[PDB]
Design a protein around this ligand. Structure first.
Ligand code: NDP
Ligand code: 18G
Length: 192
């Protein structure tokens, strides 16, 4: 692919946009996980797939039996990786852009974590879309958190729901989804 449009997909706790604690996610939101699966997997035309790109630490944190994430081309970035096509589902590379130069028959490209990767690529002009699950909690300070998004959202525009719906096709978007003490909403952002 040449100059693909890329989407960041992430779930973060407002207002500080925390996304992790000591290498783990600070929640397990079952509908959110299913949303992540559906959006990263779905294609708009047949006989294509999407790519998911992640940092080496996030890859290693997926239990080895459940990686690669099924039905998507998985790309793993490490500063120690030379370019290598491991198999039809796994690519090793050292830049998002060079990894995608190696690829054909891919529709959408999603960045799926983690914090270091997100915080670099937010300032990469290939990234055109942010799919942010905005999570709220009555006492967010009580949530164990040490890892945060650094997203300059002043340069971004949160789109109306109709734009997110168009992006996700027939995927059902429930509003104010509650699981335990967490309430969340799916959002779409584009560059100003
Ligand atoms: N809430 C959410 O939606 C999500 C949250 N997370 C959270 O993120 C946290 C993990 O993130 P983090 O620890 O930062 O790890 P990352 O998954 O971001 O991996 C960081 C690694 O990626 C590689 N890397 C980073 N930048 C580059 C570059 N420019 N070129 C090549 N390789 C690069 C490096 O690998 P190497 O060291 O091998 O060089 C680096 O050590 C966890 O707490 C997890 O819970 C993760 C996904 C989703
Ligand atoms: C979907 O499953 C996983 C997803 C992840 C990461 C890649 C993620 C994510 C993610 C989610 C859940 N929602 C959103 N909105 N964006 C994301 N990037 C993971 O990180 C170590 C681990 C798992 C995982 C998979 C199988 C078993 C256990 C954990």
């Amino acid at each position: 692919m040449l100059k693909p449009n890329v989407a960041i997909i992430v779930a973060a706790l407002k207002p500080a946009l925390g996304i992790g604690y000591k290498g783990k996610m600070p929640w397990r939101l079952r509908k959110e996980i299913r949303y992540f699966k559906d959006v990263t997997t779905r294609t708009t035309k047949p006989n294509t797939r999407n790519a998911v790109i992640m940092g080496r630490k996030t890859w290693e944190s997926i239990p080895q039996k459940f990686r690669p994430l099924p039905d998507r081309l998985n790309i793993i970035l490490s500063r120690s990786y030379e370019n290598e096509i491991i198999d039809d589902n796994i690519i090793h590379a050292s830049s998002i852009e060079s990894s995608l130069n190696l690829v054909s028959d891919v529709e959408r490209v999603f960045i799926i974590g983690g914090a270091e990767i997100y915080n670099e690529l937010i300032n990469n002009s290939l990234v055109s879309h942010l799919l942010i699950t905005e999570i709220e909690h009555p006492s967010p300070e009580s949530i164990e958190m040490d890892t945060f998004l650094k997203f300059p959202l002043e340069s971004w525009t949160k789109q109306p729901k109709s734009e997110l719906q168009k992006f996700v096709g027939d995927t059902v978007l429930e509003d104010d989804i509650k699981e335990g003490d967490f309430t969340y909403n799916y959002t779409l952002w584009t560059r100003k």
